[PDB]
Design a protein around this ligand. Structure first.
Ligand code: ACO
Ligand code: ACO
Ligand code: ACO
Lengths: 211, 211, 210
């Protein structure tokens, strides 16, 4: 079902895209939803509740089983060619999560800019766990059941190992991050989608990563 | 919903509590199940197998999608105002697990006092993993997919970070616990449920924790 | 029962075995499934997609809620008396996974001989993460939500702690492995199934380990 309530809510979804079994809900005003061409956003549950919310999903994006919650003044951006399996994305506290071009997120991803509940200093009663944006660079591959906490920024051309929890940002591109505490465990690499290729040179989508 | 088999089983669920979609199975005798007032115990699967088992859920408890297995002479105690998402609790070896008041347990918790199977020392043939009680103090917030194993004691007003595993007791209240191995990672704090409270002083339920 | 489709597939499931609520799908050629006596393979979903794949399950194996995916020329063998709760097994790159006798695999296991996608070194463009066989020895106990990645070999009589991820093989038998990174955390032990025993000496299945 598609469902919309409020004023100046804009919703653009190409007729060349598939939204089978997906629920989209927009409640509030000046919210915008864009889904580009040749997308498959299936069996997903997407919920925008608040004001000035922006969901932008570029062309050739495939998402299956995404559970997504966005609150007022929040935005989610997902760039072209990115693929995503079952998972969860939560944005609150007027923040932003972005996901770069040609990412590959395996089932079980949990991504959030927020803890959803405040932690205060006993010293001065002040809140000290405020939301922080999440940026996942281009060509990032998340293995199964990876969790990305607030403020985490992930460099381009990175692979995150199965069941890793990221609570801190990294700077180094072209590497594998794994373990607990999450750490760079391999450098100078590039990942691809197709195991049938002999070398990186056989995959024309990787040219920009080795030069 | 409900299904019994045995005698002198005492089951009292307040008419003011909800058990929508919940299964209660009691197989055995002299068992008592107590569910207080204004409770919401939903989409759960609770079973007691054996004798003299104690399930006590105090008032103002909300539990959704709990799978719970209780064996002979075991007791589960959940104090008032506690909320719990999806998860599992397993109790055996006629042992004990209690959960304090105003706890907030996020989806994916796993809590157990037992390994369910023996491990013995080759050195002296003795068993070395006897079950041990779990004590979760007042006002504890478990992040997602937190695992709480046998004999673990958690102090009052503690936050456990997402995907942490706890195999050991902590004694310090007012702190955040995270990482592998789990350790105090922040000190002198207090958590609340509502973000829209700027400071702890704006939260009536936090009075006690600052003195 | 099962949905089989292609040329010369052989499915041999002992008449003494229960397959309640299990879906077995075979699509391809020259595939072979053997399930031995007194097995209970229930609520599982076993998919063989490709050619020359083999699945071998020995006697007295009990599996509940297994989601299994085998590709061409792959092989899964599960030895006698092994029990398995809900979990996932994935095999590709023409590799194999082998699970020993009398293992105990708790709910949430994930076992794979492949990453499903290539990683290349920038120094020469060559692939560095080829799939690698997984071998779980006899009498291995996986606790809850254990993940076993490619190439991993686990020794006999090992307990893996719950929520442990294994990315590397171990060589030492009779130990508890846990934590992150995964390490030997207790040596010189043996586990059993029934906790009603003063000592190991009261469990006859355990004699062979001392
Ligand atoms: C959409 C889809 O189809 S994807 C879904 C299915 N696939 C997956 O989930 C991916 C599974 N793979 C993994 O999680 C990881 O192994 C991947 C691919 C990041 C890494 O693969 P590889 O490049 O072969 O890494 P390889 O195992 O060498 O590991 C590299 C190093 O990190 C170390 N390491 C790997 N994981 C960990 C860990 N969890 N903790 C500590 N160290 C680790 C290894 O010991 C190794 O160290 P060493 O070189 O000093 O000996
Ligand atoms: C019931 C519900 O609705 S809950 C819904 C879902 N929400 C969640 O699961 C909450 C997610 N948050 C977390 O898991 C934790 O970070 C929290 C909330 C417990 C604590 O958050 P914060 O107070 O912001 O502290 P923060 O996460 O920055 O960590 C504090 C210190 O611990 C460190 N740390 C955090 N996680 C880890 C980790 N896994 N390993 C090692 N160190 C860690 C941080 O790096 C920081 O170190 P520093 O001394 O350099 O600052
Ligand atoms: C089919 C079925 O019925 S299975 C049912 C479900 N059961 C389970 O999932 C099993 C749950 N148990 C576990 O995951 C593990 O604790 C088991 C049993 C291997 C380990 O149990 P035990 O033998 O009692 O060992 P326990 O965890 O104390 O031992 C851990 C040791 O290494 C350390 N350790 C344990 N876990 C960790 C961890 N996650 N990270 C770091 N260190 C750890 C502990 O400190 C302890 O050593 P210490 O006392 O010197 O400090």
């Amino acid at each position: 079902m598609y469902s919309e309530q409020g004023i100046n809510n804009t919703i653009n979804i190409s007729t060349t895209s598939l939204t089978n079994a997906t629920q989209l809900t927009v409640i509030g005003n000046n919210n915008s939803v864009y889904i580009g061409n040749n997308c498959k956003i299936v069996s997903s549950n997407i919920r925008l509740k608040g004001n000035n919310i922006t969901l932008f999903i570029a062309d050739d994006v495939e998402i299956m089983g995404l559970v997504c919650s966005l609150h007022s003044d929040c935005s989610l951006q997902i760039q072209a060619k990115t693929t995503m399996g079952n998972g969860e994305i939560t944005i609150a506290e007027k923040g932003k999560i972005s996901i770069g071009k040609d990412c590959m997120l395996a089932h079980g991803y949990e991504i959030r800019n927020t803890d959803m509940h405040p932690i205060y200093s006993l010293e001065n009663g002040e809140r000290i766990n405020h939301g922080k944006d999440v940026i996942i660079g281009n060509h990032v591959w998340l293995g199964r059941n990876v969790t990305i906490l607030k403020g985490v920024c992930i460099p381009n051309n990175v692979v995150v190992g199965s069941h890793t929890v990221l609570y801190k940002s990294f700077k180094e591109p072209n590497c594998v991050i794994a373990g607990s505490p999450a750490k760079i465990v391999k450098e100078n690499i590039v990942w691809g989608r197709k195991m049938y290729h002999s070398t990186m040179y056989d995959d024309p989508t990787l040219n920009e990563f080795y030069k």
